[PDB]
């Protein structure tokens, strides 16, 4: 919803879902790249945290 000043309300669920989608897309690309284990390990850790 907008705050009448050209912006929109935060709607925290959108922020959490945005974090999850960002992290999941990053992990998907890193799996498509056959990336080394430490970086994909860190990304899976941060996905789980998200």
Partner 1 sequence: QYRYTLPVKAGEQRLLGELTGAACATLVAEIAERHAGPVVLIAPDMQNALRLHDEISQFTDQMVMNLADWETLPYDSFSPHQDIISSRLSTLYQLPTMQRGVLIVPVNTLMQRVCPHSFLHGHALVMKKGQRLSRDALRTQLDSAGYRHVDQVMEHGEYATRGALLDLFPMGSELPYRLDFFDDEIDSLRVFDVDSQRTLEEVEAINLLPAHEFPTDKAAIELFRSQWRDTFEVKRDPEHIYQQVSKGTLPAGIEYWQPLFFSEPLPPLFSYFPANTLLVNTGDLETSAERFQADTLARFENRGVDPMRPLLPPQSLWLRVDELFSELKNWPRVQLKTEHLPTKAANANLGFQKLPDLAVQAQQKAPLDALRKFLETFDGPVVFSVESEGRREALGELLARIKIAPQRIMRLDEASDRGRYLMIGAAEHGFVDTVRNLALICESDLLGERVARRRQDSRRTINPDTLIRNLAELHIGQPVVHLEHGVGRYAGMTTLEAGGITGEYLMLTYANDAKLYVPVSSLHLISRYAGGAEENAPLHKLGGDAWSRARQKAAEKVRDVAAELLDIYAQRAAKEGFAFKHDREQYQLFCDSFPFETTPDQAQAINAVLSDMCQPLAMDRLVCGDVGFGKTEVAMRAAFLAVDNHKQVAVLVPTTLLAQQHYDNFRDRFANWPVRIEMISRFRSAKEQTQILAEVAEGKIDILIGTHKLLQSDVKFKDLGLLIVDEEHRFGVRHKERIKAMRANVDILTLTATPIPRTLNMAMSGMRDLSIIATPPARRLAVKTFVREYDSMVVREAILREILRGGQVYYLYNDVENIQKAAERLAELVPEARIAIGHGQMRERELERVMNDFHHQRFNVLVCTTIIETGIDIPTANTIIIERADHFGLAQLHQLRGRVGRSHHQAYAWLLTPHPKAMTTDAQKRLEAIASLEDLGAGFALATHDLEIRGAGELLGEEQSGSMETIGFSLYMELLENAVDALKAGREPSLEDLTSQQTEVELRMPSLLPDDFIPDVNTRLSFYKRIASAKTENELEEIKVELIDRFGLLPDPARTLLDIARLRQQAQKLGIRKLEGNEKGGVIEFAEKNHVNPAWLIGLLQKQPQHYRLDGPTRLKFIQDLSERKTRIEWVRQFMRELEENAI
Where along the sequence are the contacts to partner 1 (CB under 8 A)? 22, 26, 29, 33-36, 38-39, 42-43
CB of 30 to partner 1, least distance (A): 8
Closest separation between CB of residue 20 and partner 1, Å?
A: 14
Q: How far is CA 15 from CA 10, 28, 31, in A?
A: 8, 20, 24
Q: How far is the CB of 5 from partner 1 (least distance, A)?
A: 16
The H or E element spanning position 17 is helix 12-32
- Of residues 14 and 22, the one with the C-beta less far from partner 1: 22
Q: How many C-alpha atoms does 28 have within 13 Å on its Cβ side? A: 6
């Amino acid at each position: 919803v907008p705050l009448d000043g050209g912006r929109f309300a935060t709607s925290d669920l959108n922020d959490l879902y945005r974090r999850v989608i960002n992290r999941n897309n990053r992990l998907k690309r890193l799996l498509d790249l056959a990336a080394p284990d430490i970086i994909v390990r860190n990304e899976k850790r941060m996905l789980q945290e998200a």
